[PDB]
Amino acid sequence: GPAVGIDLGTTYSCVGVFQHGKVEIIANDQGNRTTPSYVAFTDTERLIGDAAKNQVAMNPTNTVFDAKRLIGRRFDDAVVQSDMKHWPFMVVNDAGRPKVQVEYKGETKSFYPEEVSSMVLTKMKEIAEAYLGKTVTNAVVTVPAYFNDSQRQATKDAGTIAGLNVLRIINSPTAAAIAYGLDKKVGAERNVLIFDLGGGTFDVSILTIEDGIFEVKSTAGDTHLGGEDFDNRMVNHFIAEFKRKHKKDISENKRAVRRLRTACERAKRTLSSSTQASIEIDSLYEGIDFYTSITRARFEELNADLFRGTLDPVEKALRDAKLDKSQIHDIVLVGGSTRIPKIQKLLQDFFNGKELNKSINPDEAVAYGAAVQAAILS
Ligand SMILES: Nc1ncnc2c1ncn2[C@@H]1O[C@H](COP(=O)(O)OP(=O)(O)O)[C@@H](O)[C@H]1O
Ligand SMILES: [Mg+2]
């Protein structure tokens, strides 16, 4: 069985396999090339991936996500403390270790963050195995560059309990670089900038590659800035619109809002290729159908400050690395949010027209690289 590369993401995960000199990013049951890092517990079953996310509005307290933010940390971590105040699921202390508490089959159960991730990892494994038609054991899993030893350990453990023999844990920026073959020895030092704007995290990393050896010169970003924030801006915009037209503030109905958000995330994606998308939601509030639309122009303006602010961390990364804008040789786009045209324009204008590397879907870049690395390692 060939080794696979797995991108264990904060919001979405992806798995790819190197086969016959080519890397294939594997699609799941629903045909998606990335699957949400969601796990849901109901009266009758345990849902993972699309099935889990597809019922979040209906089962909020028992639908777990953002496990990557918990993994490898302590309950006392100020991060954990700050974060938990935003999740609809319970997090409890267990001898210093945080645990997610849910109700599975009427019985109350709690899980260590590594167990939730192992569930997502299991899903990826099934996906690869269904595709390959054979058992998958060896794997290369990615982790952010800033993950400490504990977090790396936990990620490794999540792998082992999923029945995966984790060959190596590599940083995602390095994985992105390898996908573009930027590790090929050219007899010279190379500076690369990884711009990773994902579902909920923003990471900028500057790598220096010499003789086939990576060196993370600097990193910057925002652990709480991703595609979700753009979705919210759309949500708030439409709540205001619904109220003007119907005089009904749907803010309190957690379901109506969550449904609108799902509709927005979908419209958002369409806006990356089309200039406008329609929002068709039957019975949003009471029995009122919400039928409307947004233009790319309006979308961009609703997130103007967020998009623009994206550059500040880029400047920081440069100065920490002691490099000038002209000294970086390659710029690679990672993360689903980098498919947004306004983000690409903005980064390019900043780097004075420099060509951006983005022939490989940004949300599949990390998986692609890990698959290549898995291959060389096995
Ligand atoms: N075409 C698109 N335009 C904008 N956002 C997109 C597009 N395709 C996927 N996304 C977004 O990218 C995020 C997923 O990013 P991804 O890199 O897959 O995740 P992660 O951050 O979990 O590694 C979500 O916010 C999703 O809405
Ligand atoms: Mg990612």
Coordinates of C-alpha atoms and ligand atoms in Angstrom, one line a residue:
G1 CA 0.0 0.0 0.0
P2 CA 1.4 3.4 -1.0
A3 CA 2.0 6.1 1.7
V4 CA -0.3 9.1 1.5
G5 CA 0.0 12.8 2.4
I6 CA -2.5 14.3 4.7
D7 CA -3.3 17.9 5.4
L8 CA -5.0 17.9 8.8
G9 CA -6.5 21.4 8.6
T10 CA -8.3 23.6 11.1
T11 CA -11.5 23.8 9.0
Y12 CA -10.8 21.5 6.0
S13 CA -8.6 18.5 5.5
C14 CA -7.3 17.0 2.3
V15 CA -5.5 13.8 1.3
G16 CA -3.3 13.1 -1.7
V17 CA -1.3 10.2 -3.1
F18 CA 1.8 10.2 -5.3
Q19 CA 1.2 7.5 -8.0
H20 CA 3.1 7.1 -11.3
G21 CA 5.0 10.4 -11.0
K22 CA 1.8 12.3 -10.5
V23 CA 0.0 13.3 -7.3
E24 CA -3.7 12.8 -7.1
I25 CA -5.8 14.7 -4.6
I26 CA -8.5 12.3 -3.6
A27 CA -12.2 13.3 -3.5
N28 CA -14.7 12.0 -0.9
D29 CA -18.2 10.5 -1.1
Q30 CA -19.8 13.8 -2.0
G31 CA -17.1 14.4 -4.6
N32 CA -15.4 17.2 -2.7
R33 CA -11.6 17.4 -2.8
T34 CA -11.4 18.6 0.8
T35 CA -13.6 17.6 3.7
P36 CA -14.6 19.7 6.8
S37 CA -12.8 18.8 10.0
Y38 CA -16.1 18.3 11.7
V39 CA -17.4 15.4 13.9
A40 CA -21.0 15.1 15.1
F41 CA -22.5 12.8 17.7
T42 CA -26.3 12.0 17.5
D43 CA -28.7 9.6 19.2
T44 CA -27.9 6.9 16.6
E45 CA -24.5 7.7 15.1
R46 CA -21.2 9.4 14.8
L47 CA -20.9 11.6 11.7
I48 CA -17.6 12.8 10.2
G49 CA -16.9 15.3 7.5
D50 CA -19.6 16.7 5.2
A51 CA -22.3 14.7 6.9
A52 CA -21.2 16.3 10.2
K53 CA -21.0 19.9 9.0
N54 CA -24.3 19.4 7.0
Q55 CA -26.2 19.0 10.3
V56 CA -24.4 21.6 12.5
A57 CA -27.3 24.0 12.8
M58 CA -29.5 21.1 14.0
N59 CA -27.1 19.7 16.5
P60 CA -24.8 22.5 17.7
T61 CA -23.9 21.3 21.2
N62 CA -22.9 17.8 19.9
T63 CA -21.0 19.0 16.7
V64 CA -17.3 19.3 17.3
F65 CA -14.9 21.4 15.3
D66 CA -11.7 23.5 15.8
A67 CA -10.0 20.5 17.5
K68 CA -6.7 21.7 16.0
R69 CA -6.9 24.7 18.3
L70 CA -7.1 22.4 21.3
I71 CA -4.6 19.6 20.4
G72 CA -1.4 19.5 22.4
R73 CA -2.4 22.3 24.9
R74 CA -3.5 22.6 28.5
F75 CA -6.9 23.6 29.8
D76 CA -5.1 26.5 31.6
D77 CA -3.7 27.8 28.3
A78 CA -5.0 31.4 27.9
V79 CA -5.6 30.4 24.2
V80 CA -7.9 27.6 25.2
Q81 CA -9.6 29.9 27.8
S82 CA -10.2 32.6 25.2
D83 CA -11.3 30.2 22.4
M84 CA -13.8 28.1 24.4
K85 CA -16.0 31.1 25.0
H86 CA -16.9 30.9 21.3
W87 CA -17.6 27.2 20.8
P88 CA -21.2 25.7 21.0
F89 CA -19.8 22.5 22.4
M90 CA -18.4 21.9 25.9
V91 CA -14.8 21.8 26.9
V92 CA -14.0 20.4 30.4
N93 CA -10.8 20.1 32.4
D94 CA -9.4 16.7 33.1
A95 CA -6.3 16.8 35.3
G96 CA -5.1 19.9 33.3
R97 CA -5.9 18.4 29.9
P98 CA -8.9 19.9 28.0
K99 CA -11.6 17.5 26.8
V100 CA -14.6 18.0 24.6
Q101 CA -17.8 16.8 26.1
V102 CA -20.7 15.6 24.0
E103 CA -23.8 13.5 24.2
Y104 CA -23.6 10.3 22.1
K105 CA -26.6 8.0 22.1
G106 CA -28.1 9.7 25.2
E107 CA -25.0 8.9 27.1
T108 CA -22.6 11.7 28.1
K109 CA -19.1 11.2 26.7
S110 CA -15.9 13.3 26.6
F111 CA -12.9 13.0 24.2
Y112 CA -9.3 14.3 24.2
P113 CA -8.7 16.6 21.3
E114 CA -6.4 14.0 19.7
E115 CA -9.3 11.6 19.6
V116 CA -11.5 14.0 17.7
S117 CA -8.7 14.5 15.2
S118 CA -8.1 10.8 14.9
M119 CA -11.7 10.6 13.8
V120 CA -11.1 13.1 10.9
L121 CA -7.8 11.2 10.1
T122 CA -9.8 8.0 10.0
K123 CA -12.2 9.6 7.5
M124 CA -9.2 10.6 5.3
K125 CA -7.8 7.1 5.5
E126 CA -11.2 5.6 4.3
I127 CA -11.3 8.1 1.5
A128 CA -7.8 7.1 0.3
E129 CA -8.5 3.4 0.7
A130 CA -11.8 3.6 -1.2
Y131 CA -9.9 5.3 -4.0
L132 CA -6.8 3.1 -4.0
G133 CA -8.8 -0.1 -3.4
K134 CA -6.2 -1.1 -0.8
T135 CA -5.2 -0.6 2.8
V136 CA -3.5 2.7 3.7
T137 CA -1.1 2.6 6.7
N138 CA 1.9 4.8 6.2
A139 CA 1.3 8.6 6.2
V140 CA 2.8 12.0 6.3
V141 CA 0.7 14.5 8.2
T142 CA 1.3 18.3 8.2
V143 CA 1.3 20.8 11.0
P144 CA 1.8 24.6 11.1
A145 CA 5.4 25.8 11.3
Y146 CA 4.8 27.3 14.8
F147 CA 3.5 24.0 16.4
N148 CA 5.6 23.1 19.4
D149 CA 6.7 19.6 20.5
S150 CA 3.5 18.9 22.5
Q151 CA 1.3 19.9 19.6
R152 CA 3.4 17.8 17.2
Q153 CA 3.2 14.9 19.5
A154 CA -0.6 15.1 19.8
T155 CA -0.9 15.3 16.1
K156 CA 1.3 12.2 15.8
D157 CA -0.8 10.4 18.4
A158 CA -4.0 11.3 16.7
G159 CA -2.5 9.5 13.8
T160 CA -1.5 6.4 15.6
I161 CA -4.9 5.9 17.2
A162 CA -6.4 6.2 13.7
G163 CA -4.3 3.2 12.7
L164 CA -2.0 5.4 10.7
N165 CA 1.8 4.9 10.8
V166 CA 2.9 8.5 10.8
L167 CA 6.2 8.4 8.8
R168 CA 6.9 12.1 9.5
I169 CA 5.3 15.3 10.7
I170 CA 6.3 18.2 8.3
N171 CA 5.4 21.9 8.4
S172 CA 2.7 23.0 6.0
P173 CA 4.8 25.8 4.5
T174 CA 7.6 23.3 3.6
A175 CA 4.9 21.0 2.1
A176 CA 3.6 23.8 0.0
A177 CA 7.1 24.5 -1.3
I178 CA 7.7 20.9 -2.2
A179 CA 4.5 20.8 -4.2
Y180 CA 5.9 23.4 -6.5
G181 CA 9.3 21.6 -6.6
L182 CA 10.9 24.6 -5.0
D183 CA 13.3 22.2 -3.2
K184 CA 15.2 21.2 -6.3
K185 CA 18.9 22.1 -5.9
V186 CA 19.7 25.1 -8.1
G187 CA 23.1 25.7 -6.5
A188 CA 22.0 28.9 -4.8
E189 CA 20.0 30.1 -1.8
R190 CA 16.3 30.6 -2.4
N191 CA 13.8 32.8 -0.4
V192 CA 10.2 31.8 -0.6
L193 CA 7.1 33.4 0.9
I194 CA 4.2 31.1 1.8
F195 CA 0.9 33.1 2.1
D196 CA -1.6 30.8 3.7
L197 CA -5.1 32.3 4.3
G198 CA -7.3 29.4 5.2
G199 CA -10.7 28.8 6.8
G200 CA -9.9 30.3 10.2
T201 CA -6.2 30.9 10.3
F202 CA -3.8 33.2 8.4
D203 CA -0.1 32.2 8.2
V204 CA 2.8 33.9 6.4
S205 CA 6.1 32.1 6.4
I206 CA 9.4 33.0 4.8
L207 CA 11.5 30.0 4.0
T208 CA 15.1 30.0 2.9
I209 CA 16.1 26.9 0.9
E210 CA 19.7 26.0 0.2
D211 CA 21.0 22.6 -1.0
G212 CA 17.6 21.1 -0.4
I213 CA 17.5 22.2 3.2
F214 CA 14.6 24.4 4.5
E215 CA 15.1 27.1 7.1
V216 CA 12.1 29.0 8.4
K217 CA 13.4 32.5 8.5
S218 CA 10.3 34.1 9.9
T219 CA 6.5 33.6 10.4
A220 CA 3.6 35.9 11.1
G221 CA -0.2 36.0 10.6
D222 CA -3.3 35.8 12.7
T223 CA -4.7 32.6 14.3
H224 CA -8.2 34.2 14.1
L225 CA -8.5 35.4 10.5
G226 CA -9.8 33.1 7.8
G227 CA -12.6 32.6 5.3
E228 CA -15.1 32.3 8.2
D229 CA -14.7 36.0 9.0
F230 CA -15.6 36.9 5.4
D231 CA -18.7 34.8 5.7
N232 CA -19.8 36.6 8.8
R233 CA -19.5 40.0 7.1
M234 CA -21.9 38.7 4.5
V235 CA -24.2 37.3 7.2
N236 CA -24.4 40.6 9.1
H237 CA -25.0 42.3 5.8
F238 CA -28.0 40.1 5.0
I239 CA -29.5 40.2 8.5
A240 CA -29.7 44.0 8.0
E241 CA -31.3 43.5 4.6
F242 CA -33.9 41.1 5.8
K243 CA -34.8 43.5 8.6
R244 CA -35.3 46.4 6.2
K245 CA -37.6 44.3 3.9
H246 CA -39.4 42.3 6.5
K247 CA -39.0 44.2 9.8
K248 CA -37.8 40.9 11.3
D249 CA -34.5 40.7 13.1
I250 CA -33.5 37.0 12.8
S251 CA -30.4 37.4 14.9
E252 CA -31.8 35.4 17.8
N253 CA -32.9 32.4 15.7
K254 CA -29.5 30.5 15.8
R255 CA -30.8 28.2 13.1
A256 CA -31.9 30.8 10.6
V257 CA -28.5 32.5 11.0
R258 CA -26.5 29.3 10.7
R259 CA -28.5 28.5 7.5
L260 CA -27.8 31.9 6.1
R261 CA -24.1 31.5 6.9
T262 CA -24.0 28.2 4.9
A263 CA -25.7 30.0 2.0
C264 CA -23.1 32.8 2.2
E265 CA -20.0 30.6 2.3
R266 CA -21.4 29.0 -0.9
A267 CA -22.1 32.3 -2.6
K268 CA -18.6 33.5 -1.5
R269 CA -17.0 30.6 -3.5
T270 CA -19.1 31.5 -6.6
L271 CA -17.9 35.1 -6.3
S272 CA -14.3 33.9 -6.9
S273 CA -15.3 33.1 -10.5
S274 CA -18.4 35.1 -11.2
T275 CA -19.3 38.7 -10.5
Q276 CA -22.5 37.9 -8.6
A277 CA -24.3 35.1 -6.9
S278 CA -27.9 34.6 -5.7
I279 CA -29.0 33.5 -2.2
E280 CA -32.1 31.4 -2.3
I281 CA -33.3 30.3 1.1
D282 CA -36.8 28.8 1.7
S283 CA -38.4 29.7 5.0
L284 CA -35.5 31.6 6.6
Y285 CA -37.6 33.1 9.4
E286 CA -41.3 32.3 10.2
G287 CA -42.3 31.2 6.7
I288 CA -40.6 34.0 4.7
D289 CA -38.4 32.8 1.9
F290 CA -35.2 34.9 1.6
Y291 CA -34.4 35.3 -2.1
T292 CA -31.6 37.8 -2.9
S293 CA -28.1 38.2 -4.3
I294 CA -24.6 39.9 -3.9
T295 CA -22.1 41.2 -6.4
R296 CA -18.4 40.7 -6.2
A297 CA -18.1 44.5 -5.8
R298 CA -20.2 44.5 -2.7
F299 CA -18.5 41.4 -1.3
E300 CA -15.1 43.0 -1.7
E301 CA -16.3 46.2 0.1
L302 CA -17.9 44.2 3.0
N303 CA -14.4 42.8 3.6
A304 CA -12.2 45.7 2.5
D305 CA -10.5 46.3 5.8
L306 CA -9.9 42.5 6.4
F307 CA -8.4 42.0 2.9
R308 CA -6.2 45.1 3.2
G309 CA -5.0 44.2 6.7
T310 CA -3.7 41.0 5.2
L311 CA -0.6 42.9 4.1
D312 CA 0.5 44.0 7.6
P313 CA 1.6 40.5 8.6
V314 CA 3.5 40.2 5.3
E315 CA 5.5 43.4 6.1
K316 CA 6.3 42.0 9.6
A317 CA 7.5 38.7 8.2
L318 CA 9.9 40.5 5.8
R319 CA 11.4 42.8 8.4
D320 CA 11.9 40.0 11.0
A321 CA 13.6 37.9 8.3
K322 CA 15.7 41.0 7.4
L323 CA 14.7 40.7 3.8
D324 CA 13.5 43.3 1.3
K325 CA 10.4 42.9 -0.9
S326 CA 12.8 42.4 -3.9
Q327 CA 14.7 39.6 -2.1
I328 CA 12.0 37.0 -2.1
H329 CA 12.3 34.7 -5.2
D330 CA 8.9 32.9 -5.1
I331 CA 5.5 33.5 -3.6
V332 CA 3.1 30.6 -3.2
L333 CA -0.6 30.8 -2.4
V334 CA -2.0 28.4 0.1
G335 CA -5.5 28.2 1.6
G336 CA -9.0 28.3 0.2
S337 CA -9.3 32.0 0.8
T338 CA -6.4 32.9 -1.6
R339 CA -8.7 32.0 -4.5
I340 CA -10.3 35.4 -3.9
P341 CA -9.4 37.7 -6.8
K342 CA -9.1 40.8 -4.6
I343 CA -6.6 39.0 -2.4
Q344 CA -4.4 38.0 -5.4
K345 CA -4.5 41.6 -6.8
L346 CA -3.6 43.0 -3.4
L347 CA -0.6 40.7 -2.9
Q348 CA 0.7 41.2 -6.4
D349 CA 0.4 45.0 -6.2
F350 CA 2.4 44.8 -2.9
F351 CA 5.1 42.7 -4.6
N352 CA 5.1 45.0 -7.6
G353 CA 3.5 42.7 -10.2
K354 CA 5.5 39.6 -9.2
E355 CA 4.0 36.4 -10.6
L356 CA 2.1 34.4 -7.9
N357 CA 2.4 30.6 -7.8
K358 CA -1.1 29.2 -7.9
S359 CA -1.5 26.5 -10.6
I360 CA -2.2 24.0 -7.8
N361 CA -5.5 24.7 -6.0
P362 CA -4.3 26.6 -2.8
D363 CA -6.5 24.4 -0.6
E364 CA -4.8 21.2 -1.9
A365 CA -1.2 22.5 -2.0
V366 CA -0.2 21.2 1.4
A367 CA -1.7 17.8 0.8
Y368 CA 0.0 17.7 -2.6
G369 CA 3.4 18.4 -1.0
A370 CA 2.9 15.8 1.8
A371 CA 2.0 13.2 -0.8
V372 CA 5.3 13.8 -2.6
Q373 CA 7.2 13.7 0.7
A374 CA 5.4 10.5 1.7
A375 CA 6.5 9.0 -1.6
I376 CA 10.2 9.8 -1.3
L377 CA 10.1 8.5 2.3
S378 CA 8.6 5.2 1.5
Ligands
LIG1 N1 -13.3 29.6 -4.2 C1 -13.2 30.0 -3.0 N2 -13.3 31.3 -2.7 C2 -13.2 31.7 -1.4 N3 -13.0 30.9 -0.4 C3 -13.0 29.6 -0.7 C4 -13.0 29.1 -2.0 N4 -12.9 27.7 -2.0 C5 -12.8 27.4 -0.7 N5 -12.8 28.5 0.2 C6 -12.7 28.8 1.6 O1 -11.4 28.5 2.1 C7 -11.6 28.0 3.5 C8 -11.0 26.6 3.4 O2 -9.7 26.7 3.4 P1 -8.7 25.5 3.4 O3 -7.3 25.9 3.0 O4 -9.4 24.5 2.7 O5 -8.7 25.3 5.0 P2 -7.8 25.2 6.2 O6 -7.6 26.6 6.6 O7 -8.7 24.4 7.1 O8 -6.5 24.5 5.9 C9 -13.0 28.2 3.8 O9 -13.2 29.5 4.4 C10 -13.8 28.1 2.5 O10 -14.8 28.9 2.4
MG2 MG -4.4 24.8 5.6

